[PDB]
Design a binder for this molecule. Sequence first.
Ligand code: SF4
Ligand SMILES: [Zn+2]
Lengths: 118, 182, 244
Amino acid sequence: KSIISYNGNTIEIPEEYTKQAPNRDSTWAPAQASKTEIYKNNMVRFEQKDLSKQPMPYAGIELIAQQPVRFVHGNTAVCDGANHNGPGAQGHPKIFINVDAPGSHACQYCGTRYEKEH
Amino acid sequence: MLPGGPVPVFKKYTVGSKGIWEKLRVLLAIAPNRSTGNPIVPLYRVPTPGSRPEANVYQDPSSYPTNDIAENPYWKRDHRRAYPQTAFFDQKTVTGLLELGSEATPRIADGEAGTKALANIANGGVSFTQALGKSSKDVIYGEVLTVNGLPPVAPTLAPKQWKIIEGEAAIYPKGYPCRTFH
Amino acid sequence: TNVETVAVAPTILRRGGDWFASFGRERNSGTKLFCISGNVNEPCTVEEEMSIPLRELLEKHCGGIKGGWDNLLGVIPGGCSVPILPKNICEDVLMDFDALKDVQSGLGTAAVIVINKQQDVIRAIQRFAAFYKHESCGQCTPCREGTTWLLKAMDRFRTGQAKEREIDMLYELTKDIEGHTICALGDAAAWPIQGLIRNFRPEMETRMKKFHDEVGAVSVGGWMKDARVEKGKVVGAPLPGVHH
Ligand code: SF4
Ligand SMILES: [Zn+2]
């Protein structure tokens, strides 16, 4: 990608590093700065540096859309992101989701979805 | 021996010598009791803290009357909102205790008469020196000083009667310029 | 007013009043329809003077108890809004407001509900709690919530899924309701469980021991040791009452 600097020059950056994350291009929030506006404002400190080795973790908004929906019999689904493998809580506070309404419903802490069997 | 040593080597948990080298060490040691100080690898810090079995059975500890679920109201074990007030006593509030008395030893007239008697002192009606001179012997010797007439001493909450240990129990022998108090 | 309270009145006025005072004890005068029901030989509806003994009412105007007077576990003399009575106190207790009040009960609509020993009294009380849950108007906090807690507890005590100290917890839960409501339905939702606890405690404890032997150990709240939230549901333990 070729990003135009403010001072009239250009900023060449390869495509693998303009993506907001290795699994998603676009931003997932209105106030999020896109990588192009980042570079365009901060190339003085990116110039001789290697972009392969900079931190580029995966996004969760796309890895949680992949997770299959869960189902239940009733107007409630209980969630507690508990490991069940090691001791202690290790999860998030118990949350009872209402699932009577036609669509899926997600926990507010984790994005796991629940539905009323249909 | 005393309750504080000396103790041998085979009860100290240190890495020592073995064989002829032990005989040589006990020969060439100022005090053969003493240890190298290197801990014993099989024991010290084993099992490692990140592999203790006891963490799976662990549960948050508690005490009975506070973990009781039925007759355990908080307003009985709320010790913070029961905090003792900071009392304040200016000369006015002290002369009233002198000219008058106290709930334990009243000397006050009944009715609105005694009420205005309190009121005369609430304002500058009678002074502290005036009621110090108007105080009979039973007042002072029994409410300011002691019954014996002596003044009170700086009180101690938790008194300490000291005692000296000398000779064999003492931390240091007699010659040294330090001693030992119980 | 109650229907009967005005329905009688023309006759009390026509006929002089004093004879009505001649019925019953000093402050509990007159006649009172009694709707008997339950495990009685002959369920009936009858009219009698107040201060009549409970035992004559059970034996004469009806067919006595089904199975004999000593096949009696308890009796409820005012409907569900009144604590149950034990057999010891049904031997000589008059059916008036005062004496029933003197045994920590009361006369309601004078509807007697009888219960033999072949019955699960705990099933009767949890049913009354499910009723009051269904009839709470949903306005004031203690009835909205306390009734559902009481149901969730009584459904567990029915199978033993509890500890013994949960009964004293339950007594406190009723005291969380007994005076903090608007209407009287909150007190009426409390009292029968106070009467069960006061009298028939060992049956509760015995069902609990029966659970501890037949299923497994239990903690506060009906959580066992293998209980877990797996995939939106609790799986490691039975769940009493859930039907939805
Ligand atoms: S106690 Fe009475 S007023 Fe309050 S919520 Fe229950 S039914 Fe309604
Ligand atoms: Zn969740």
